[PDB]
Amino acid sequence: ASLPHPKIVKKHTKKFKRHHSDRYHRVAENWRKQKGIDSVVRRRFRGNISQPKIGYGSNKKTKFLSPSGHKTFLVANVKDLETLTMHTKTYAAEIAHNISAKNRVVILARAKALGIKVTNPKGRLALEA
Amino acid sequence: GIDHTSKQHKRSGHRTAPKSDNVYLKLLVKLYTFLARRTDAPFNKVVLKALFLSKINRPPVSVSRIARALKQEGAANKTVVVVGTVTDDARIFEFPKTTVAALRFTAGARAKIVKAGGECITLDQLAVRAPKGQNTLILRGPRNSREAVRHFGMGPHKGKAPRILSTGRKFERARGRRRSKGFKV
Amino acid sequence: SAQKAPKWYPSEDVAALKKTRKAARPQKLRASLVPGTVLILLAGRFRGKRVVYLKHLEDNTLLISGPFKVNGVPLRRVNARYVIATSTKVSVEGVNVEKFNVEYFAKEXXXXXXXXXXXXXXXXXXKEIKAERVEDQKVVDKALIAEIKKTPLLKQYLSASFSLKNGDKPHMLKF
RNA sequence: UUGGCGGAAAGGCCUUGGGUGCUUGCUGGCGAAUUGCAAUGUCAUUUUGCGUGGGGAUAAAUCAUUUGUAUACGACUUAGA
RNA sequence: GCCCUGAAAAUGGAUGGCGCUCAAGCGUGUUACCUAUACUCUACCGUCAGGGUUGAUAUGAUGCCCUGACGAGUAGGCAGGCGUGGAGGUCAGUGACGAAGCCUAGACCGUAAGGUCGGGUCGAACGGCCUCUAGUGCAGAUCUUGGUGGUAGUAGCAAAUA
RNA sequence: GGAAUACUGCCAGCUGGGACUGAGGACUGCGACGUAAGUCAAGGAUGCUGGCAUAAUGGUUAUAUGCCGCCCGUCUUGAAACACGGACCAAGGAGUCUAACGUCUAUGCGAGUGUUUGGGUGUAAAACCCAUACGCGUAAUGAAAGUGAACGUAGGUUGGGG
RNA sequence: AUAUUGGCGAGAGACCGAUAGCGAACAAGUACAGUGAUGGAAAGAUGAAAAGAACUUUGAAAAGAGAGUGAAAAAGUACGUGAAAUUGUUGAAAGGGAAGGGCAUUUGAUCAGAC
Numbered sequence A: 001a002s003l004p005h006p007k008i009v010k011k012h013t014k015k016f017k018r019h020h021s022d023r024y025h026r027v028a029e030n031w032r033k034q035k036g037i038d039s040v041v042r043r044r045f046r047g048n049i050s051q052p053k054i055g056y057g058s059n060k061k062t063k064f065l066s067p068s069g070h071k072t073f074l075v076a077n078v079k080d081l082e083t084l085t086m087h088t089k090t091y092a093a094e095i096a097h098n099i100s101a102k103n104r105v106v107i108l109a110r111a112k113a114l115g116i117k118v119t120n121p122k123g124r125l126a127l128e129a
Numbered sequence B: 001g002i003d004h005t006s007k008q009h010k011r012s013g014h015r016t017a018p019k020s021d022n023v024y025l026k027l028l029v030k031l032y033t034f035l036a037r038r039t040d041a042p043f044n045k046v047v048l049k050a051l052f053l054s055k056i057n058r059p060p061v062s063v064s065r066i067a068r069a070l071k072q073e074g075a076a077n078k079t080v081v082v083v084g085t086v087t088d089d090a091r092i093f094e095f096p097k098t099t100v101a102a103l104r105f106t107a108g109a110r111a112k113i114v115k116a117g118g119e120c121i122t123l124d125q126l127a128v129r130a131p132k133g134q135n136t137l138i139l140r141g142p143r144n145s146r147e148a149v150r151h152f153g154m155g156p157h158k159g160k161a162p163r164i165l166s167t168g169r170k171f172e173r174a175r176g177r178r179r180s181k182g183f184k185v
Numbered sequence C: 001s002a003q004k005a006p007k008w009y010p011s012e013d014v015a016a017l018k019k020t021r022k023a024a025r026p027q028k029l030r031a032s033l034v035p036g037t038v039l040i041l042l043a044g045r046f047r048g049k050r051v052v053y054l055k056h057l058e059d060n061t062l063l064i065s066g067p068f069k070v071n072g073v074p075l076r077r078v079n080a081r082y083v084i085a086t087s088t089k090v091s092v093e094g095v096n097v098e099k100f101n102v103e104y105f106a107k108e109x110x111x112x113x114x115x116x117x118x119x120x121x122x123x124x125x126x127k128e129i130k131a132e133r134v135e136d137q138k139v140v141d142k143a144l145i146a147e148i149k150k151t152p153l154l155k156q157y158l159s160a161s162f163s164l165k166n167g168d169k170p171h172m173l174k175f
Numbered sequence D: 001u002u003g004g005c006g007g008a009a010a011g012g013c014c015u016u017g018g019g020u021g022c023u024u025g026c027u028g029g030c031g032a033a034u035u036g037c038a039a040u041g042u043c044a045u046u047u048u049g050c051g052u053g054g055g056g057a058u059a060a061a062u063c064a065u066u067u068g069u070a071u072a073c074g075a076c077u078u079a080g081a
Numbered sequence E: 001g002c003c004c005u006g007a008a009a010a011u012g013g014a015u016g017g018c019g020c021u022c023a024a025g026c027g028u029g030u031u032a033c034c035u036a037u038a039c040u041c042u043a044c045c046g047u048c049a050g051g052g053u054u055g056a057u058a059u060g061a062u063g064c065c066c067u068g069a070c071g072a073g074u075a076g077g078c079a080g081g082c083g084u085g086g087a088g089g090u091c092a093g094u095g096a097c098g099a100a101g102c103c104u105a106g107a108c109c110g111u112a113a114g115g116u117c118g119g120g121u122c123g124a125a126c127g128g129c130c131u132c133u134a135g136u137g138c139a140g141a142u143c144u145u146g147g148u149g150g151u152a153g154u155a156g157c158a159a160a161u162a
Numbered sequence F: 001g002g003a004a005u006a007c008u009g010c011c012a013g014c015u016g017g018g019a020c021u022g023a024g025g026a027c028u029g030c031g032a033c034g035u036a037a038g039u040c041a042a043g044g045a046u047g048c049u050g051g052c053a054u055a056a057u058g059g060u061u062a063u064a065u066g067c068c069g070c071c072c073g074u075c076u077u078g079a080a081a082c083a084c085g086g087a088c089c090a091a092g093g094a095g096u097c098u099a100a101c102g103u104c105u106a107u108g109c110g111a112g113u114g115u116u117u118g119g120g121u122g123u124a125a126a127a128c129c130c131a132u133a134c135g136c137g138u139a140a141u142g143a144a145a146g147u148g149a150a151c152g153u154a155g156g157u158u159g160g161g162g
Numbered sequence G: 001a002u003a004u005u006g007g008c009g010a011g012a013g014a015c016c017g018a019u020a021g022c023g024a025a026c027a028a029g030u031a032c033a034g035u036g037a038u039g040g041a042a043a044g045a046u047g048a049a050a051a052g053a054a055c056u057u058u059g060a061a062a063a064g065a066g067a068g069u070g071a072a073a074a075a076g077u078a079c080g081u082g083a084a085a086u087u088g089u090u091g092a093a094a095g096g097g098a099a100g101g102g103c104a105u106u107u108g109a110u111c112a113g114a115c
């Protein structure tokens, strides 16, 4: 349903949790660079956790691409959906989390007419089911 | 690894584009940057570097400093380009005719040059007449005359000017400025 | 807008590929293989059986008989690398072989609606054979079999399957 | 099935005698395909639950009660149809 | 030269251990072999440098494209970014057909700051973008206030006769 | 007297096996083989064929196994320390505002410049308009009384972009 | 014409939004402590409306179970939403002197893309 594109290699798939985020509960899982002077993470000792850094950068050809080979462009309503009409082999409409069950059947039904990939096709609309 | 014989990734000291957001200014660049490419004309390169400068390095060029340069032998009919502002001077009297293309003219300065039967041109009307920059005299203002630099390299026996708020005889005229009190500088 | 509409979008035109320089040359077989040589099938259904090498097909495969009336292996295709060639030999001279090409061995076209419907529902749906193949199997064999009765023990040999015993170190054994 | 031998952890090793299947020692007649050009292309041995059919046997322990050769408490040691 | 005597320290004990005696010891020599984030080659990320191109000819000129080199880092400097309370503008933006909040070893995007969808709960308001403004981001301060554990069904509940 | 072989070196000599990679995306170039049209291993992978389409590959997650991995913050030449703080969790929590100034950048005007003390007006703390002053600048130098910047095309010499 | 953190009366705000903002959004200079001078808190939110659970049954009774009100009782005067520590039950997993992490795969669980 997309342009051909090179094969996508993520090149690092672990999530980079913060050091000690597991041990203490007060320490959240979002990444943070250890700034400490003694730190064994900051100093990169063998067998400690990886740090994020620009070398893990993703290929510019495939960046922001979903597995389907699409970019996902967030869509709040029917008149938004119609900005994508040309790029239908490129961008794939996502429907904004807060849209009502009633307006979604109208988005979906109108995006079927345009041949646009919808990435969350079963919303509250299968919740009518 | 390598032995580096010089600092790595070190970016050239030079302004690659005007730090101003003036739309019209960036247009001018768009013009000359294209000329610097597609003609040889060392002149155009000079102008492009000129557009980029900070205001401190585009000091005003007087009208009288233009008059002076037109009196250089064989220069009469050359058109004088100033990237920066041209300003008025009340001190000269009899002013030549010619043409002056600049970034900016103050009102008096413009009235001075047109009343002499001359002409005031912008940088682009300058490129239409002289794409190569044929027969043109580039001028620069006296950028070391700027006040601030009286203070530079301040130090003993340097003959430079102390940074100071207010001047009278009670301010830094006493000990170390004359041999009667201590030493002299 | 849920999300601000982007300033570019790329062009959906899919570019053609560059003119590639690769020519398909004739495949060159290793020295050991010559028509009439006896082969040892190293995998597949008939893996382990010893068989007789007839022709070299266009698709780089090997035409094979074995022949069927002996060890029960039919005419067939075999990939050249899945074989061990022995040093022993039979004359393939009096054998036709000029008929069989890649098209001859073409599988019947499989339908995506029928191979789901007839395979899942009927697991007792039974195989059959084209009357042709079974006759052109005969022809090959009557020339081959007549040749296999020349040398002593050969007939027993082909029927008997091959395998490695203890102490057998394949980097040694000559075949 | 007849006997023997094996206590080092013997749980196996020989032997008599008949019954029964195979026998490529040799000579034959049939069958094999399509698993489509390879995909381990599954065969082994461990427990445990139910199921059919037969042989087999038909108890204890703890608490509670109780002794004091015992005992912080459990534990130990006794007695009770 | 090797080996032995010379040669004695406190918990049990250290060629790292096991153990090795034409060695698995010492001296020497010859090859084969194992292995680093080093070197070579290729891919991708970023930075810097040098360079090409809107000439009429759709959607970024701070853009697209080409070639090369490089990449450790505390104190520290600069740059591009993500996040929060409010403000001007704008999507005639989202919303009782469920807004925000919380929950989720369910999914996707980003090197990451974080962003996005799905499900459950819930019941009234809230977001994207261009800009403005700050009482704007927490793991620590014997930090401050509130809440709750382990300790632990433990220490204990034994003066004054019953 | 006549050769051979080893050793060291060269071949723009010939051939078999093996593993990893397949970036790029019309054509432009350098070549090669050719009598010729053309073909090619010559500025980066294509051709043939099979199974499955369905939890199979891949993702996440729990776990096992090999190998590695001391507890964070901090002062310190040196911290896993038998140095200090830290039981646990939530909310709060620390380079701010102002007067005067320096360098730099941006914008306005430019020998001038600054409306907003005050006056006028107003859709009313906004916005719009303005007189005279005053500040800083256009002249220095002396403790001061005091004097006050063209012999020359505002000079000569050496470089110096254009 | 100038002053004005007091008193009375009005009008506002790029201010705070219940650990903030005055100490005090509530019976706050209250309760409470101290001989005294003084010191000085915590504490807002059921629902549109109490419609605040008649009646049956079990228990000595609080209550429980039904019943009913209500859009909702996953709003029951312990009351909007209801996080975390911490805790109970069920489920899944592992466990020879800690647990936790990194690299890689097996086993189990689980899930997107697919067209």
Ligand SMILES: [Mg+2]
Binding pocket: A013, A014, A015
């Ligand atoms: Mg990721």
Ligand SMILES: [Mg+2]
Binding pocket: A037, A038
């Ligand atoms: Mg250190």
Ligand SMILES: [Mg+2]
Binding pocket: B001, B002
């Ligand atoms: Mg390097």
Ligand SMILES: [Mg+2]
Binding pocket: none
């Ligand atoms: Mg000794």
Ligand SMILES: [Mg+2]
Binding pocket: E014
């Ligand atoms: Mg030892």
Ligand SMILES: [Mg+2]
Binding pocket: E015
């Ligand atoms: Mg020793």
Ligand SMILES: [Mg+2]
Binding pocket: none
């Ligand atoms: Mg050693």
Ligand SMILES: [Mg+2]
Binding pocket: none
């Ligand atoms: Mg050793």
Ligand SMILES: [Mg+2]
Binding pocket: none
């Ligand atoms: Mg040695």
Ligand SMILES: [Mg+2]
Binding pocket: none
């Ligand atoms: Mg560049």
Ligand SMILES: [Mg+2]
Binding pocket: none
């Ligand atoms: Mg660095």
Ligand SMILES: [Mg+2]
Binding pocket: none
């Ligand atoms: Mg946001």
Ligand SMILES: [Mg+2]
Binding pocket: E085, E135
């Ligand atoms: Mg605020």
Ligand SMILES: [Mg+2]
Binding pocket: none
């Ligand atoms: Mg919601």
Ligand SMILES: [Mg+2]
Binding pocket: none
């Ligand atoms: Mg959780």
Ligand SMILES: [Mg+2]
Binding pocket: none
């Ligand atoms: Mg703060």
